[PDB]
Amino acid sequence: RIHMVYSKRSGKPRGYAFIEY
């Protein structure tokens, strides 16, 4: 899952798994 996205670039790079990182 994600915790805190923006959108795609700024939100989920490595941020795909945001909870962790």
Curated annotation (Swiss-Prot):
Location(s) in or outside the cell: Nucleus speckle; Nucleus, Nucleoplasm
Post-translational modification: The N-terminus is blocked. Extensively phosphorylated on serine residues in the C-terminal region.
Miscellaneous notes: Major ribonucleoprotein antigen recognized by the sera from patients with autoimmune diseases, such as systemic lupus erythematosus.
Assembly and interaction partners: Component of the U1 snRNP. The U1 snRNP is composed of the U1 snRNA and the 7 core Sm proteins SNRPB, SNRPD1, SNRPD2, SNRPD3, SNRPE, SNRPF and SNRPG that assemble in a heptameric protein ring on the Sm site of the small nuclear RNA to form the core snRNP, and at least three U1 snRNP-specific proteins SNRNP70/U1-70K, SNRPA/U1-A and SNRPC/U1-C. Interacts with SCNM1. Found in a pre-mRNA splicing complex with SFRS4, SFRS5, SNRNP70, SNRPA1, SRRM1 and SRRM2. Found in a pre-mRNA exonic splicing enhancer (ESE) complex with SNRNP70, SNRPA1, SRRM1 and TRA2B/SFRS10.
Comment, domains: The RRM domain mediates interaction with U1 RNA.
Role: Component of the spliceosomal U1 snRNP, which is essential for recognition of the pre-mRNA 5' splice-site and the subsequent assembly of the spliceosome. SNRNP70 binds to the loop I region of U1-snRNA.
Protein name in UniProt: U1 small nuclear ribonucleoprotein 70 kDa
Natural source organism: Homo sapiens
Taxonomic lineage: Eukaryota, Metazoa, Chordata, Craniata, Vertebrata
Gene responsible for this protein: SNRNP70
Residues of the full protein shown: 131 to 151 of 437
